[PDB]
């Protein structure tokens, strides 16, 4: 049709939002769909050890790495065109899996898919700001975006299990092709153009791009290696220190140089900083709780992964119910109360997991997951606050900061709280007490590796005390990390409450 339209869009632009929203939802499911499809692929091909781990690590590494420069590319190339290019590349790579030369091919496909997805999430958030220029309307527009980006993590297991039970493994991407294609069929017909002019844009900076990409990838991979190998190796130490110093170099280059790639000047405004801090610790909660509760449902209640994922619906429904009512509450109560209130309610819902539910049962888990979904829904207010006082080009820039902080929060939460949970499980199990009466040596490692491993080694060895002891230890560890997360969440809530100024309000931008 046309990729250059002024005046934004008429009153029907809301439909455009929908066309984006649901599509983004699909885009945020793929990783989950891959994870529960990991064993199946392993049966059909050669995981080759480290190759199987690279398969799941490459998409997160690339998404966290190529997220800053691609935002500038989208800004200088045409936001609508960048979004359409990303969607088309995503669809093509999803159709490319049909050729199953299971090999380095999978790694290359996942790398290309991550590169394509790096243009989706950062660009969609900026396009939402571009289409909607009204604070009251932009708040209720961003609420729907918040629901999607995350209803995706909860709904991933259900759709993945339903897809894997029928059809075959290669349908894991085949479902994503007809849904993404429709996207572009609408993405070209109801989207405006931004195309920031050459007036304030100079030539591209090679050092900025290379340094930013390498620093971000190094940081993420160092965090992952810390989680997997422990703080004893020297290579992750040197990698994290080099990544930090390179990020410092990047910040110092972007601070003073003219027309910077990522203008670090929004952090001066408190309104930006409040939302940026809020998003990280909003994602911390699910990054821990979703995985830990999935394992708990897997073990304690003895459910299949599909049903285990299905049992986690209350967390999703809590967010789906609370998010639409959030902007209305924020408009009349201000952000200073509403935004901290969501984090506080999430903290309360993760406290009720420890204080009330030491011998946890599913009723307590659901009545806690609802409150966690409330703090999930607070992301809408936080996102709004971020784009409250920001010009168009700066908003296109700031979507990248939002998405990068979001992904870093997910990685940090998963690594740190999973490591804490594993350490607590290992210390509570106390496998050294089961030596003279059974499990010794190699089997012991399995008992320390995971709760499922301990349960099945107890089943095989014929000694039954190990199963009950391991299940109790896992329950205690899960509950303890829930309490620790609650403490962190309250501490962050106090900071976010103190940060937001009094006169700030999501409506009446000026």
């Amino acid at each position, epitope marked *: 049709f046309t990729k250059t339209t002024d005046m934004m869009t008429s009153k029907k632009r809301w439909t455009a939002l929908v066309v984006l929203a649901v599509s983004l939802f699909v885009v945020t499911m793929d990783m989950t769909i891959l994870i529960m499809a990991l064993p199946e692929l392993v049966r059909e091909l050669e995981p080759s050890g480290t190759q199987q781990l690279w398969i799941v690590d490459i998409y997160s590494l690339v998404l966290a790495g190529f997220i800053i420069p691609l935002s500038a590319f989208a800004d200088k190339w045409g936001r609508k065109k960048a979004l359409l290019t990303g969607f088309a590349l995503f669809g093509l790579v999803s159709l490319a899996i049909f050729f199953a030369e299971s090999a380095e091919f999978v790694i290359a496909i996942r790398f290309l898919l991550g590169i394509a997805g790096a243009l989706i999430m950062p660009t969609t958030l900026s396009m939402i700001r571009v289409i909607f220029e009204n604070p009251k309307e932009r708040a209720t527009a961003l609420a729907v975006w918040s629901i999607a980006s995350s209803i995706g993590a909860v709904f991933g297991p259900i759709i993945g299990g339903a897809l894997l039970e029928q059809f075959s493994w290669h349908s894991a991407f085949l479902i994503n092709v007809p849904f993404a294609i429709i996207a572009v069929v609408a993405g070209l017909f109801l989207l405006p153009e931004s195309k920031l002019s050459k007036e304030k844009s100079h030539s591209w900076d090679i050092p900025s791009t290379i340094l930013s990409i390498a620093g971000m990838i190094g940081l993420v991979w160092s965090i992952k290696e810390f989680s997997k190998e422990g703080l004893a190796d020297i290579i992750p130490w040197v990698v994290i220190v080099l990544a930090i110093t390179m990020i410092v170099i990047f910040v110092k280059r972007n601070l003073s140089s003219s027309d910077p790639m990522l203008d670090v000047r929004l952090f001066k405004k408190r309104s930006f900083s409040a939302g940026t801090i809020a998003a990280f610790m909003t994602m911390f909660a699910m990054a821990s709780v979703l995985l830990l509760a999935s394992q708990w449902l897997q073990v304690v209640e003895e459910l299949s992964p599909f049903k285990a994922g299905l049992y986690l619906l209350p967390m999703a429904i809590g967010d789906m119910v609370f998010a639409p009512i959030a902007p209305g509450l924020a408009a009349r109560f201000g952000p200073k109360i509403v935004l901290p209130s969501g984090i506080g309610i999430a903290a309360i819902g993760m406290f009720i997991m420890y204080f009330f539910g030491h011998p946890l049962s599913y009723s307590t888990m659901a009545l806690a997951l609802i409150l966690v979904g409330a703090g999930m829904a607070s992301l809408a207010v936080a996102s709004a606050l971020i784009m409250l006082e920001t010009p168009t080009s700066k908003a296109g820039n700031a979507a990248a900061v939002e998405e990068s902080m979001y992904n870093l929060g997910n990685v940090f939460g998963v690594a740190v709280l999973g490591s804490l949970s594993s350490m607590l499980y290992r210390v509570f199990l106390d496998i050294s007490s089961f030596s003279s009466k059974g499990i010794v040596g190699d089997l012991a490692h399995v008992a320390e590796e995971s709760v499922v491993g301990a349960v099945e080694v107890a089943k095989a060895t014929g000694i039954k005390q190990l199963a*009950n002891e391991a299940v109790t230890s896992f329950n205690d560890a899960f509950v303890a990390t829930a309490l620790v997360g609650g403490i962190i969440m309250i501490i962050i809530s106090i900071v976010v409450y103190l940060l937001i100024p009094k006169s700030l309000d999501i409506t009446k931008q000026k």
Partner: nanobody
Amino acid sequence: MQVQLQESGGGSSLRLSCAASGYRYSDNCVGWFRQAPGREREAVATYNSGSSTWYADSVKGRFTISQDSAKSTVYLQMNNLKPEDTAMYYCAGRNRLGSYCYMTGDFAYWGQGTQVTV
């Protein structure tokens, strides 16, 4: 299923026996208590975490506890009795968590009651 505990062996060294009920891995997961006439309920010879037998300070050496998986039961043998005991000697079951039974905490199920005479 709500677990039901039955006791026997009590009456006029003596062996008390407590029968188990609906339970998976029904071992190392049932303990012994006693409600003294003068005092309240007390903990005599239960199972701790890992592999430990928590005998009371009074009857640490006198009493003994045994368990057999087949026909799931627990046996408590008392020798060299003293001016205490009597009591009720309740059987006790650990608080189930899902289908598995163990849990650090207090006991939820308490059997019938009395008739240990010494």
